[PDB]
């Protein structure tokens, strides 16, 4: 249709942003970046709609232009910046450090971390290819292009990044029995160690997963992100740790703690 779309009609905007059906008309269209449109999160929805640090999007823009926010180490002035998974939100004033990881509902959750944890990133390798001048390279889910990796790193493995520097430090391979975070589908936001990989050549490898409640589910290799060992992630999970309570269970819990 004659060229690049510049607007986003608030109604087509991804639901996991939790934007109200009315009041307004448009949404922030995530800038070009390290993350796909429908799995990012603009700074404005985070600062304003997720953190209540703002009301007018204009005020968000000001706040931001004041260099307060910084993502993964760089200041960032983009109002509708495509911040997404594993990214490190950093407020030097207020002394707050955030990491963007999924709920169990499927949304991005407000998660407060250490100042120490906020100095290294996790990154699922999406591809690893030989480069020009014979220099091999790995590229992870967030478009991070790191050269000279370990000759034992394949696709779908996961990786620990410096943030303050570029070098990959530690890495975990995609084996059976690995604490895995589901990043897509409606089984997303859950966590559960991996069971077994349905192969299928040239047509979507299915991944069999099991959480710490002996609940099982499948997905596809795409939505699967490796994050560690049994009971031993490499990042700070949030309240619930991807176990998915049924409607009746949730009903029971939220009306269990009820004594005013």
């Amino acid at each position: 249709a004659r060229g690049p779309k510049k607007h986003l009609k608030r109604l087509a905007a991804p639901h996991h942003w939790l934007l109200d059906k009315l009041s307004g008309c448009y949404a922030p269209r995530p800038s070009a970046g390290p993350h796909k449109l429908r799995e990012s999160l603009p700074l404005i929805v985070f600062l304003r709609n997720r953190l209540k640090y703002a009301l007018n999007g204009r005020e968000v823009k000001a706040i931001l232009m004041q260099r307060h926010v910084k993502v993964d180490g760089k200041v960032r002035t983009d109002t509708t910046y495509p911040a997404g998974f594993m990214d490190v939100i950093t407020l030097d004033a207020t002394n707050e450090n955030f990491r963007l990881v999924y709920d169990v509902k499927g949304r991005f959750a407000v998660h407060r971390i250490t100042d120490e944890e906020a100095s290294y990133k996790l990154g699922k390798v999406k591809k690893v290819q030989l480069g020009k001048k014979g220099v091999p390279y790995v590229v992870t889910h967030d478009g991070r292009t790191i050269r000279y990796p370990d000759p034992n790193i394949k696709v779908n493995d996961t990786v620990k990044i410096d943030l303050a520097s570029g070098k990959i430090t530690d890495f975990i391979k995609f084996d059976a029995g690995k604490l895995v975070y589901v990043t897509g589908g409606r089984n997303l936001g859950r966590i559960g160690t991996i069971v077994h990989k349905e192969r299928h050549d040239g047509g979507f490898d299915l991944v069999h997963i099991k959480d710490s409640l002996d609940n099982t589910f499948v997905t596809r290799l795409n939505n699967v992100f490796v994050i560690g060992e049994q009971g031993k992630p490499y990042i700070s999970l949030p309240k619930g740790k991807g176990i998915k309570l049924s409607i009746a269970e949730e009903r029971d819990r939220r009306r269990a703690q009820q004594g005013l």
Binding site: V135, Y148, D150, P151
Partner: protein, 167 residues
């Protein structure tokens, strides 16, 4: 009121396709062409005005022409243009020969000179120096990282020889 146009011939009006960077037409948008009327370049009775230019002066002074003289409103702004209006050789410092313009702010006559561009300056030399410096630094950087991967691969090969020695 239609304008002539050098190189059409015909002592008559013709309608041509006019483009960027060509007479009797200034565009209003990128690559905007327009078909406009234009008078020929051959003189005739239909001409209201004839733009002529003196090549040689006769034996008589013409009133508001030969008798009088107007100034070239501006002066040399680039470095070597200044160095060539007078011809100075890249030596005599250009910052004195820049024409300065007086202008009386009522009871405060002022002195304003251009802003010499293409001038070789300290800060330019500093930036240049930084270019070459940074370039070489990253060169050796990438070289040493290359040596590093060379080592890792080498003593990985060594661990493959060691492992193949185990079994």
């Amino acid at each position: 009121g239609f304008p002539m146009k050098q190189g059409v011939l015909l002592p008559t009006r013709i309608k041509l396709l006019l483009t960027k960077n060509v007479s009797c037409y200034r565009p209003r948008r990128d690559g905007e062409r327009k078909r406009k009327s234009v008078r020929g370049a051959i003189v005739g009775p239909d001409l209201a005005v004839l733009a002529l230019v003196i090549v040689k002066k006769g034996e008589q002074e013409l009133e508001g022409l030969t008798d009088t003289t107007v100034p070239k409103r501006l002066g040399p702004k680039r470095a070597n243009n200044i160095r060539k209006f007078f011809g100075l050789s890249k030596e005599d410092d250009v910052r004195d020969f820049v024409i300065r313009r007086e202008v009386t702010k009522g009871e405060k006559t002022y002195t304003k000179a251009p802003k010499i561009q293409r001038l070789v300056t300290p800060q330019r030399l500093q930036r240049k120096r930084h270019q070459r410096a940074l370039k070489v630094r990253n060169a050796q950087a990438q070289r040493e990282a290359a040596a590093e991967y060379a080592q890792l691969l080498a003593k990985r090969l060594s661990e493959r020889k060691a492992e193949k020695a185990e079994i």
